């Protein structure tokens, strides 16, 4: 029981570590946002509770009824075809990074949005200028992720914190 | 051997060392000879007199208007357990501690000395000077840091590290190892002869380390020598 | 001017480890950290020297009303030294009140005094 | 008992089958009246020669040239601790170990065995065959891999864990619920009659099972069953 | 060969309450687990079935020198009786050096034996 009971300790000490490195990351993130204020924006790490369910379930729904690396793992698993991937992708991104990005998928797009308080929710857009629309959703989805990280994390804390309690 | 020592220490006046190899085996000694003679168990079995067998082998350990007798002991912790009455009981006569962790020693960090567990009554610039006390605490917190980033950065890579993180624990592996020393009795076990640092010596390299003087040394360097000149021999050595 | 202390003291230690991995929050949360810096520098003393209650009062009537907070974390301590032989020196009135009725000096008459000190005072 | 079941052994050499519905009572007797006896409390209060007389009793009952005896013992713990001083010391003198948790019976399985701290003398290779003694081993393994992973489904969640970690927990649910048969004598507390299983079928559905042939079909399916076709008979009822 | 098993497997035990997070860890962190998980296979072995010891010190040298890192680690056992059989018809030299001079023997002439058998594997 010792030894369960450390381990459980240790890892409550790893997501209170994780939560407020995503915290302070959280707050780098809206700060450049307000700064600054088909297509999936998705997560690289995971650890983010369901940010990332929630997008790739609707995605999955809205394909299967409309259309008939852990966001790309998901399609990978689900044996689909993409043209584009951008998997790794830098914290703060400068417009060049993502510029030829941008250039080459304009050459229907679903992402999360930024509430505070685990409201972050899902959100689409029609377009066919936009390149700007597609770093808007982008600074948004990096917001909503750490976010979400951040509350996730939280939420493990206090299950850790319980099972150390209740021991 | 305390009346051995304690013979040295009054009749021939220099400075006498009294080694004892483990305590925890002479509290667990008494405590078998109280359960023979029958007196009732105290706390985890011990004998009810543990602390006035321990007072009284650990208060004739004392400098005097004569002499002087210091006094090594080492203590076997049973299961990792602190709050054991030997150890704990030792803990009220002990000017020094230094706490042995078996994660160094898997790691090749002999002593194997706890840097953040070792505590010392006299780690205090009254008596060692402030030079000596800054660079103990600036190690000491350097350490700390690093070990509080441990799991950021096992889980994170370096590169989510500030600048001043990166730099902490680039400096705080290079402290980690450089408190490691070849031993004279080690070259029985791996043949490396040992080495000798005088106090001067050792400040002078800690603050040497702790200026980023060589923050270009790979850290293998560092792993097992005496003086950081020694360290600067080694890193030639590998081809640096 | 306990319950000041009292309030910034624990404001600041309940989230001491937010500061620590930088990227601080909110510009109250920054003034908090600010302010419990200066306060866990203030309330640490040196050994065997004890500080009269006259003494007491002052500094922290000091701290507590906005005034540290100009001053560098690491330079309160000295700041602190050099405010009691200030005060024993050119501000007796101010401890002799202390002394005789139990109650702050005068708030204005304090407020000027550490304001001097603090314009002469070499940080 | 053992006297009647010791003569048929040796004055008649005949295989014998000696049931004992608590052996822990003949301890918990000897302990009752251990104080009075005159001897002093040994650990937990239990006699001082708790090991040497259940070891004067236990020595007897076993197989010899004249003929075997088949014993099966069932073993009260008491408090539910299997550190009691009774049942640590009966442990070594029995070569097939069956361990009844309360956990698992609060849970609906029955005959609530836990799957990994009862092992037996047989489990070999050379003695069920390699094919048991893998699907065997693979099962203990699936199940000490999801009992450890329970920890972590209760602090991360069930989606942080990986998709390796997703089928283990998958299989080892339907593994500790397909664990689990009708019993005979279970018809007057469940109105259902009973089930036996041939080893080489439980084999087989467990080799089935960890497969993954049987993946699709939903959990409750796999309790009180007996062949693994009677869990797709379940199945057919949803 | 033994002094470098006793490091990985410490380095791996400074990882395994990471591993819970394993699927997005660091490449570094990633590195020491599959190094940690290949050394756990290595160190497995059957009932009543001891292997001398020259086979042993070839079997670590093996592990600890990066050799079973492209492998699966499902394998690794498969691996350990294969390799075996493979000394005994090859290596013969390489196990009699050891029995003798109780010493690791060449180690391009192992380097070459080990990669000989990584392409019969």
């Given amino acids: 029981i010792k030894t369960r009971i450390n381990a459980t300790k240790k890892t409550s000490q790893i997501t209170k570590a994780m939560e407020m490195v995503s915290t302070s990351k959280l707050n780098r993130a809206e700060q450049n946002a307000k700064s600054f204020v088909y297509l999936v924006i998705t997560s690289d790490r995971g650890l983010a509770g369901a940010y990332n369910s929630n997008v790739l379930r609707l995605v999955y729904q809205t394909i299967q009824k409309r259309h008939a690396r852990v966001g790309l793992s998901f399609f990978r698993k689900r044996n689909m075809p993409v043209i584009l991937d951008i998997t790794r992708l830098p914290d703060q991104p400068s417009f060049a990074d993502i510029k030829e990005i941008a250039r080459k998928t304009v050459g229907y797009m679903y992402y999360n949005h930024y509430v505070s308080a685990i409201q972050q929710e899902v959100t689409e857009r029609k377009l066919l200028y936009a390149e700007s629309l597609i770093y808007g959703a982008l600074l948004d989805a990096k917001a909503s992720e750490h976010a979400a990280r951040m509350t996730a994390m939280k939420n493990a804390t206090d299950n850790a914190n319980e099972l150390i309690r209740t021991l | 051997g305390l009346t051995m020592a304690e013979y040295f220490r009054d009749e021939q006046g220099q400075d006498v060392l009294l080694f004892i190899d483990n305590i925890f085996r002479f509290t667990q000694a008494g405590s078998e000879v109280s359960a023979l003679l029958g007196r009732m168990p105290s706390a985890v079995g011990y004998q009810p007199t543990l602390a006035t067998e321990m007072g009284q082998l650990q208060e004739r350990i004392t400098s005097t208007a004569k002499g002087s007798i210091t006094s090594i002991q080492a203590i076997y912790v049973p299961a990792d357990d602190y709050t054991d009455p030997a150890p704990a009981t030792t803990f009220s006569h002990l000017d020094a501690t230094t706490n042995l962790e078996r994660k160094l020693a898997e790691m090749g960090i002999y002593p194997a000395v706890d840097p953040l567990a070792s505590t010392s009554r006299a780690l205090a610039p009254e008596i060692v000077g402030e030079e000596h006390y800054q660079v103990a605490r600036k190690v000491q917190q350097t350490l700390q840091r690093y070990k509080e980033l441990q799991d950021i950065i096992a889980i994170l890579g370096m590169d989510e590290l500030s600048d001043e993180d990166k730099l902490v624990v680039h400096r705080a592996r290079r402290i980690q190892f450089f408190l490691s020393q070849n031993f004279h009795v080690a070259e029985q076990f791996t043949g490396q002869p040992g080495s000798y640092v005088p106090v001067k010596e050792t400040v002078r390299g800690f603050k040497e380390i702790l200026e980023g003087k060589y923050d270009h040394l790979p850290e293998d360097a560092f792993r097992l020598v005496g003086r950081i000149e020694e360290v600067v021999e080694k890193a030639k050595a590998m081809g640096v | ?123």
């Fill in chain 3, 1 to 123: 001017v306990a319950g000041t202390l009292r309030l910034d003291l624990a404001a600041y230690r309940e989230l001491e480890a937010f500061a620590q991995f930088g990227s601080d929050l909110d510009k109250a949360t920054q003034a908090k950290l600010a302010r419990g810096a200066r306060t866990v520098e203030v309330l640490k003393q040196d050994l065997h020297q004890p500080i009269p209650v006259e003494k007491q009062v002052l500094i922290i009537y000091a701290l507590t009303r906005g005034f540290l907070d100009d001053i560098p974390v690491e330079d309160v301590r000295r700041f602190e030294k050099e405010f009691y032989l200030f005060l024993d020196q050119n501000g007796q009135h101010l401890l002799e009140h202390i002394r005789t009725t139990k109650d702050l000096p005068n708030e204005d008459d304090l407020n000027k005094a550490i304001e001097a000190f603090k314009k002469t005072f070499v940080v």
